[PDB]
Design a protein around this ligand. Structure first.
Ligand SMILES: Nc1nc2c(ncn2[C@@H]2O[C@H](COP(=O)(O)OP(=O)(O)O)[C@@H](O)[C@H]2O)c(=O)[nH]1
Ligand SMILES: Nc1nc2c(ncn2[C@@H]2O[C@H](COP(=O)(O)OP(=O)(O)O)[C@@H](O)[C@H]2O)c(=O)[nH]1
Lengths: 617, 431, 40, 431
């Protein structure tokens, strides 16, 4: 049976991916966006988390209700639906399918009575929904193609006939006076006056009439809402703004994040001179700022997938979680060590994590022109990764959180003017050599002591995904896109096999016994094969609702996992099939995964960036 | 390590320079604050070509802004990337040139030119090695054209060997903004011929045509035109800033483009310009980029190359591309359109390849064409200038600033001589 | 005191967009034996 | 790798083409967003026949939509599969042809035809190898028939050797939608006889009869008829797109079907068309498919083959089937109905087998019959045309758009000559 232990995911691209739940005495203090679903988790890690999943594609907008409700928005698929989530129920409350294209932004009224939803494409509508029943005003039209960046509500002017909604769309600010009693929307464009900046975040004052807009130019533009005009501008945090939050108590203060990790306190009063001086610096680019733990922490998020807790009484910085950013492609386990898990990504970053507490043991970083880490292999003191440029880089594994040092690199391992990027790296049992598979179907065995090429093995004509080395100087590939897989020999001579199916493969694993080989096909079929047999022993049809993308295998040969585009990982007995345990927790198709060297433990990764840890007992 | 000193002149030049610096900072991962947030080594590898390092991680553009009216650079400072520029590099007067080239070149430009050259010399002396200066401005504007020509003359005097690149917005053929556009353009072309080593002609109506036909935008403001100009300005120098499979600097482009020193005016174009509707439906291939590049609609100059003959043409491609594909495509284009290419130059194509495509684009290609088509642009400008000068309309405004009437005749004669050279190499026969 | 109006579903908008689906739905609503043009 | 360029004309043609592209995208496993979700190698093996690869995994249909009023294209774009088509392939005018062949062929079809040929040339030059073009449109309508004949003539001029396949919706015998259907049909048939290499006649009343009798659909929408037509249009070319035990391309079908160049009109039908009630009751065998196929009610043309004589007949079967079984069935059909088959051709059957049946169907078979029965349909169209033309009713609109009256006489003479040829080969005796 699969038990979900922890999910590490954060949509670092979004501004406000993570957000606190104010006055949350119960569980689920924080809510993060990682992909299709929402990770509603406690402030402290190593605690159970819930997965609010009701969408079909990525989430484009996330909104808090200042305590009481969450909201996530869809994207494409003709079902860009605004879904309201309840804290206590943890279930969808309202499903507004009124936007033909992805919902650009969504926000909640300061009194948690109104709901603003804005689309951008082919129907640009400022829908205002009541907490009871449905919508109040149809739209105000806007214009297609105008990217609605962010939105905010005025705490003041809540007389039932007025509700001032500020909307930043590109370099345009608009104040929308909404009469919900009559359901009318009047949109006044703010007179810029040579002030053209892209607003990352918007926030009204406590008493209103002063709207602070943080821009990418590290500036907060203060605009007079009453006159609907830009009043002034002050630099706040070098690097940008990101997240802008009203001060927990404040005189006129306003906490500002920065892309440099700085957190400062900007006040409108205090003259034209600022002389920036942050009171706290977090690692990475700040995108979220809130307050929780009974308003004792600042709960600052990061574009790098990080969540951090900043104490208010002593400014103490404590990390909470880290999320690998990008499309995660491979999971590796040290040959004997179950405490360290390596996760690669299409972004040039590999995270080695301590599975005991899901902390970042070490990080491997490479420039974007080096391709993406499409396969990974962990060692007691090394991380070997095959990238999108065909190169295989081995980095010195570090501890405590640091950039790893590249010990060596096999250059141009798989790049032959028709396919670049090595996939499905594997290490020899005990450790003797390194099996690698190219994007075009070439298998290559590399010495480890001298890094010299020992075998080039080219029969498969398409992508290799799922190579595996047997127990004695032999190996086998999977060869996606050509629906066949062949067991080979290191003497540069294929040993028979070459079993062809009917559909293209996606992954292949070898059991503890040297005769059992599992393959997974896009036909959502899991095929079991005996090396001594010319035909697959059996096949399980419709293993997943959608295409299966990855297959694993326990080192004992008892069970093998299967992850697919249905976001659900299942476990199947090696010989009897069946479902030992299955669960859907990734907010994306599952791309790769790895069993622990011991009985307990399965680590899977998704295309959005979500890493899910599993206890098999 | 080959530095470039950027200068913006006039309102149009300042806006174009602000957009260009925004684009370059986005390409290098520089936020409006000067700090690097790009997460790529190559972005910082050659950042010194345009930027200088401050006390911290701040990167200050090597840009110098000129104007006679302070409002334009107030807007520049308040724009998205107004805070990267060092405040000492904003050189401003108090009374703007009333669209008067004479005011911007003789009376009011004389006082401010000392400060402008001081800032330019300060920026140049800090450079390790200087590739040269690029000046972005508009022909047909008072302060822009006047101060730009004066500064180009001064920098030519000070640094003869250093490269001079100019992005001049020539007044548009059909719809003219100001009345004195022919006068300012005629006076400025005379200076650009003599001083500017390399010059690019841009027309706002050509930009409107390309952005309405290819980009299919509905309400294109000046920001979009500035964005296209910035794209070309970046793409011409991306080989300096990024590794290239076959890299080519500005001097290499000038050497392979300019057959004779006076014929240094080029029409430029950027590919691939795709409408938002057809962005997915198109395919980014070397043949597609070449096909869109050699289309006359892609040209940012009013003159269409079909009428003239391509003296030379450089194509700077960006991305992971086949040099064989590039060379074959351009040779095939030359063979197919041998009528439009000069006979006494066997190869009219200077192909360069850079390893780093612009952000968002898998592939790109900027084009710099030296063809006799620009002859018709000069002919039209002269056709307006002669009509105005025959009756001496608005002549007193330039005369009262202290420049002789004979200067108009000299400029017109020089420009007509340039037209004659273009026609001569249009209809020159081999052997 | 907020005024409310019923939100329509995505299926209704799709039916309005598609000529075939709307006409088939109307035929199904036409009458009770075998429905006229029952199969969408 | 033998590409086909699809063209849709008029409202009926656009609707039929949209349904056809929906069917083909479903058969190749392409979602309305264009991404491949088809889960089979053979689907992507020959997807280039109808589609081109976009930037990503998106596949753009090689289709060109032509119309004079934008409403039909707006509806198609808003439809379920409106987003796969490249927006540049939508060529529309502004004022639609009022059911006027003259407006669609001379006055208004003239201006849009340049854009249409431009898009056609752009699509065709991208093709590695071109089998030809397939044009779906309706006889008896202004814009459809007008630009259909005009574009077919232009493409015949440009690409003489390349195949021309047409799916023309001939006006139905009993129920007529518009008054000027006989005029438009008379003008269009004359063009098709000269230009179209292969022409496929479809009648809305025949479609209504087949879907009311075989399908037992009681109130069939136009979408149902379009989808039957789409099934036929897919099945005619499935031998190009999928491996076959005995494959036969469009040119092979045309060679085996057309005895003499002017006798290139065919009636078609699809099998197995089963009513929902009897779907479990019907068992699919090759004899069952042939029995349904040779039935006169199965033909999608109103003319029933019993009156005429089968000159030739090709049948493209699809599915894992016995070639012996198929050949025996067709030989037995010939022997049993030898009275209905032309004597001076020993074998009037071209049997083709493809190994890939359509979605949902274990086996299928599309039929293409060249028989003299089409004589009676052309005879009826002439019977209406002559009755109208004797009194010159509605003639003044066609006259005021600028064709001589003699064009009507020439078209009627050509149609009568075609009828005479069909009768000649109906009653021709061997030796
Ligand atoms: N592409 C572009 N052209 C501009 C812009 N602003 C002005 N222009 C053009 O530049 C020409 C000259 O104006 P300009 O030189 O800036 O005026 P000046 O600064 O007082 O000399 C005018 O005809 C405008 O059409 C701009 O932002 N972008
Ligand atoms: N099978 C079918 N026939 C149609 C459809 N739409 C129109 N028709 C028929 O086609 C004939 C010609 O109409 P059409 O050419 O589309 O009109 P036009 O576009 O203005 O030239 C009419 O008599 C209609 O009965 C359709 O969607 N399917």
């Amino acid at each position: 049976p699969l038990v979900l232990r922890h999910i590490a995911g954060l949509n670092g691209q979004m501004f406000g991916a993570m957000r606190s739940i104010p006055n949350s005495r119960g569980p689920y203090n924080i809510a993060q966006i990682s992909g299709v679903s929402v990770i509603l988790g406690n402030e402290n890690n190593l605690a159970p988390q819930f997965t609010l999943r009701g969408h079909d594609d990525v989430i484009t907008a996330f909104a808090m209700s200042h305590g009481g409700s969450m909201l996530a928005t869809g994207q494409k698929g003709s079902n860009s639906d605004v879904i309201v989530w309840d804290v206590a129920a943890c279930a969808p409350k309202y499903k507004f399918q009124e936007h033909d294209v992805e919902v650009a932004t969504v926000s909640f009224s300061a009194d948690d009575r109104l709901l603003l939803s804005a689309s951008c494409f082919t129907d640009a509508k400022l829908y205002v929904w009541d907490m009871a029943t449905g919508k109040i005003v149809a739209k105000h039209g806007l214009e297609p193609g105008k990217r609605i960046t962010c939105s905010a509500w005025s705490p003041a002017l809540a007389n039932g006939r007025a509700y001032t909604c500020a909307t930043a769309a590109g370099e345009e600010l608009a104040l929308w006076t909404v009469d919900p009693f009559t359901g009318m929307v009047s949109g006044q464009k703010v007179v810029l006056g040579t002030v053209r900046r892209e607003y990352t975040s918007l926030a009204f004052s406590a008493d209103g009439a002063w709207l602070y807009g943080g821009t990418t130019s590290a500036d907060v533009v203060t605009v007079n809402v009453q006159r609907a005009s830009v009043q002034m501008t002050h630099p706040v945090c070098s690097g940008g703004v990101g997240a802008l939050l009203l001060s927990p108590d404040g005189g006129g203060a306003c906490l500002v994040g920065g892309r440099d990790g700085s957190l400062s306190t900007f006040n409108a009063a205090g003259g034209a001179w600022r002389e920036l001086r942050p009171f706290a610096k977090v690692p990475g680019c700040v995108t979220s700022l809130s307050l929780s733990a009974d308003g004792g922490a600042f709960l600052v998020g990061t574009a790098q997938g990080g969540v951090y807790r900043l104490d208010r009484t002593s400014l103490q910085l404590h990390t909470i979680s880290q999320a690998q950013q990008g499309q995660l492609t491979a999971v590796a386990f040290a040959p004997g060590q179950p405490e360290a898990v390596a996760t690669s990504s299409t972004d040039g970053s590999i995270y080695v994590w301590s599975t005991a507490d899901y902390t970042l043991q070490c990080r491997v970083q490479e420039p974007t022109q080096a391709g993406g880490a499409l396969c990974c292999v962990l060692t007691r003191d090394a991380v070997i990764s095959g990238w999108g440029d065909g190169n295989i880089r081995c980095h010195a594994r570090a501890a405590g959180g640091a950039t790893c040092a590249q010990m060596w690199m096999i250059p141009g391992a798989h790049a032959l003017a028709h396919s670049v990027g090595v996939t499905a790296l594997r290490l020899s049992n005990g450790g003797a050599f390194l099996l690698s598979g190219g994007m075009g179907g070439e298998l290559r065995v590399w010495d480890l002591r001298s890094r010299e090429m020992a075998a080039h093995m080219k029969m498969h004509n398409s992508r290799i995904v799922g190579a595996a080395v047997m127990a004695d100087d032999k190996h086998v590939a999977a060869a996606s896109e050509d629906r066949t897989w062949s067991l080979w020999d290191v003497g540069s001579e294929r040993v028979r096999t070459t079993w062809r199916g009917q559909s293209m493969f996606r992954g292949m694993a070898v059991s503890a016994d040297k005769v059992s080989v599992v393959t997974v096909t896009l036909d959502r079929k899991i095929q079991m094969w005996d090396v001594r047999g010319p035909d697959p022993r059996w096949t399980k049809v419709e293993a997943h609702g959608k295409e299966v993308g990855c297959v694993a295998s326990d080192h004992r040969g008892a069970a093998f996992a299967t992850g697919g585009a249905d976001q659900a990982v299942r476990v199947w007995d090696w010989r009897n099939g069946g479902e030992v345990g299955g669960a859907a927790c990734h907010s994306a198709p599952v791309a790769a995964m790895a069993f622990s060297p011991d009985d307990a433990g399965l680590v899977s990764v998704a295309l959005d960036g979500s890493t899910c840890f599993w206890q098999l007992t | 390590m080959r530095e470039i000193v950027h200068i913006q002149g006039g309102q149009c030049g300042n806006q174009i320079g602000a957009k260009f610096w925004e684009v370059v900072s986005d390409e290098h991962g520089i936020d409006p604050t000067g700090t690097y947030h790009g997460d790529s080594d190559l972005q910082l590898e050659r950042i010194n070509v345009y930027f200088n390092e401050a006390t911290g991680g701040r990167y200050v553009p090597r840009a110098i802004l000129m104007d006679l009216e302070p409002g334009t650079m107030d807007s520049v400072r308040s724009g998205p990337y107004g805070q990267i520029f060092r405040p000492d590099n904003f050189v401003f007067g108090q009374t703007g040139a009333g669209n008067n080239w004479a005011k911007g070149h003789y009376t009011e430009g004389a006082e401010l030119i000392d400060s402008v050259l001081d800032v330019v010399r300060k920026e140049a002396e800090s450079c390790d090695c200087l590739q040269g200066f690029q000046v972005c401005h508009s022909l047909g504007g008072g302060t822009g054209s006047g101060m730009g020509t004066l500064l180009i003359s001064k920098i030519r005097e000070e640094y003869p060997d250093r490269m001079m690149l100019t992005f001049s917005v020539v007044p548009s053929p059909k719809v003219s903004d100001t009345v004195v556009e022919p006068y300012n353009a005629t006076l400025s072309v005379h200076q650009l011929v003599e001083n500017a080593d390399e010059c690019m002609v841009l027309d706002n109506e050509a930009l409107y045509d390309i952005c309405f036909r290819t980009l299919k935008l509905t309400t294109p403001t000046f920001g979009d035109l500035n964005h296209l100009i910035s794209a070309v300005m970046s793409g011409i120098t991306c080989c300096l800033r990024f590794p290239g499979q076959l890299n080519a600097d500005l001097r290499k482009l000038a050497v392979n483009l300019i057959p004779f020193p006076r014929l240094h005016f080029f029409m430029v174009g950027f590919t691939p310009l795709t409408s938002r509707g057809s962005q997915q439906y198109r395919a980014l291939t070397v043949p597609e980029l070449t096909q869109q590049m050699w289309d006359a609609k892609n040209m940012m100059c009013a003159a269409d190359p079909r009428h003239g003959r391509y003296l030379t043409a450089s194509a700077l491609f960006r991305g992971r591309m086949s040099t064989k594909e590039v060379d074959e495509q351009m040779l095939n284009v030359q063979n197919k359109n041998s009528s439009y290419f000069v006979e006494w130059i066997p190869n009219n194509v200077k192909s360069s390849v850079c390893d780093i495509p612009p952000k968002g684009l898998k592939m790109s290609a900027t084009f710099i064409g030296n063809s006799t088509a620009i002859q018709e642009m000069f002919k039209r400008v002269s056709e307006q200038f002669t009509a105005m000068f025959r009756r001496k309309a608005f002549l007193h405004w330039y005369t009262g600033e202290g420049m002789d009437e004979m200067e108009f005749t000299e400029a017109e004669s020089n420009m007509n001589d340039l037209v004659s050279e273009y026609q001569q190499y249009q209809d020159a026969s081999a052997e | 005191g907020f005024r409310n109006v019923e939100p329509l579903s995505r299926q209704e908008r799709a039916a309005a967009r598609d000529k075939d689906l709307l006409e088939k739905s109307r035929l199904q609503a036409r009458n009770r034996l075998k429905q006229p043009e029952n199969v969408v």
